[PDB]
Subunit: 121 residues, 4 copies
Amino acid sequence: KCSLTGKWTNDLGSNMTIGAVNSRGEFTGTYTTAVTATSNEIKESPLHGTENTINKRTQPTFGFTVNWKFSESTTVFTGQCFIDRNGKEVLKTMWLLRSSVNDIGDDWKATRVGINIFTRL
Amino acid sequence: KCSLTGKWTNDLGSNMTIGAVNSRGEFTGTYTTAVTATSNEIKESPLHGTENTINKRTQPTFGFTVNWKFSESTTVFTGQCFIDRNGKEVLKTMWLLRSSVNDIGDDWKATRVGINIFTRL
Amino acid sequence: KCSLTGKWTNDLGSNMTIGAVNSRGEFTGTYTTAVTATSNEIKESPLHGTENTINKRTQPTFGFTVNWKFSESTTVFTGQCFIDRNGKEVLKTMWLLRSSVNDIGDDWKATRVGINIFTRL
Amino acid sequence: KCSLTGKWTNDLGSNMTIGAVNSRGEFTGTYTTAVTATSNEIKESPLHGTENTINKRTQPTFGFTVNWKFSESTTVFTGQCFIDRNGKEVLKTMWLLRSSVNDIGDDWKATRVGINIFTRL
Ligand SMILES: Nc1nc(=O)c2ncn([C@H]3C[C@H](O)[C@@H](CO)O3)c2[nH]1
Ligand SMILES: Nc1nc(=O)c2ncn([C@H]3C[C@H](O)[C@@H](CO)O3)c2[nH]1
Ligand SMILES: *[C@@H]1O[C@H](CO)[C@@H](O)[C@H](O)[C@H]1NC(C)=O
Ligand SMILES: *[C@@H]1O[C@H](CO)[C@@H](O)[C@H](O)[C@H]1NC(C)=O
Ligand SMILES: *[C@@H]1O[C@H](CO)[C@@H](O)[C@H](O)[C@H]1NC(C)=O
Ligand SMILES: *[C@@H]1O[C@H](CO)[C@@H](O)[C@H](O)[C@H]1NC(C)=O
């Protein structure tokens, strides 16, 4: 009932497209953000993830990594695909954004955390 | 200099094997835990991820998703491959563990966070 | 311009009252939830925290700890008091929920993470 | 058996002192870090927290906020006081570091996450 395939937009205005999910639950996609004002446009970064196929849940958990094309950073997202109080699909996710640091002594401050909610575009 | 390919063990005793990383930074492997019980014995779950290839860093960031085979949960891990002060390779990671919930009203309690440090096996 | 003192409600329906903030940035208050059951009905737990007073910012950061009265758990919340784009006060927060575990070997799964957004009641 | 009162040091070399905990579980302390090389010394910031007193656990959960004196940031810590495989006390904590941002549009990148382990000084 809740399928990851398709076009999504989030609460900060980023968009993401996800292709077909195979029988192993693997999928690829693209992740688009602004930077920043009306002016001007965008960066596209690839994403790769898997949805959990245990018990063929109608609302499966999933995870994906975005391999940023314009920085040395990586973000991972994890969450669950829900049906809301009737019909519309919603991805409730949390993410970790990992910055590159040059010294292992700075490792402690390299990880940001937050949320995103996605709806169909 | 720090390469994800190979066998790793962490601070809680789980092991992980990662395969070759392709020119897009993509890799697959397997994640093994313990400590359930048995006279052994373990579970093996596949993982899929990407290493960031921007500026061909010697200590790249990376993320991967573990698609648990024995539960409806997903974990994502993000971190950086370092050469430590002592010259040995280490993966400093943080993870989010997403539990499946039945109602979107329980979404708030579905995410655990923690760390893992990996060294070569 | 954004002051923590007063009554707040969040996105999950919990309410919070915060008292006066003293010259050191210290405050006390109460945190109320739902949605257990009853014909009511609620639990009230005390909270204690500090607002950062450096540079007398109009949108200060702050943290507080809620000492749950009905469990062995603790939550900490950190965030910033903003004047939103629409001119209304909002607390954008993130929290960690620490569960009590009996063995130090289960420490790895004792921490949940999430967000809460508060507006004036 | 595990009491928060006393002098502690962590895995990054920060120290913290915590005073007496009252009957409500409230405590104050001081949090000291370096910045950075042998040269030279330190900053001291106050801390305020509470330990959970439910079921008078020998290994209670606790939380505290550090109100940084040299920045507009706030950190909160939550964790549990353990006795380890015999006699020595250990605080296993996780933290959220909240940076001040000027626009609510940057709120999403304002929170870092990590761990600290403390032992008696
Ligand atoms: N080793 C290890 N380190 C982690 O950080 C971690 N985070 C989650 N998990 C796995 C464990 C269960 O398979 C599974 C429980 O569904 O979650 C982890 N395992
Ligand atoms: N409203 C609200 N928002 C949170 O982010 C949050 N995080 C933790 N908790 C509280 C709820 C239970 O009292 C208690 C369960 O021990 O944890 C929260 N309550
Ligand atoms: C997301 O998609 C819509 C088009 O449907 C567009 O208006 C907007 O510019 C997009 N946002 C980004 C970050 O590209
Ligand atoms: C990890 O590998 C080592 C072999 O070096 C083995 O002793 C250990 O039991 C393995 N752990 C798991 C969880 O399989
Ligand atoms: C929060 O306060 C409002 C009154 O504005 C009340 O309707 C609601 O039930 C309260 N929630 C809780 C959890 O007490
Ligand atoms: C912590 O305490 C010890 C003294 O016991 C000292 O060597 C060290 O400088 C301290 N570290 C900091 C950050 O002050």
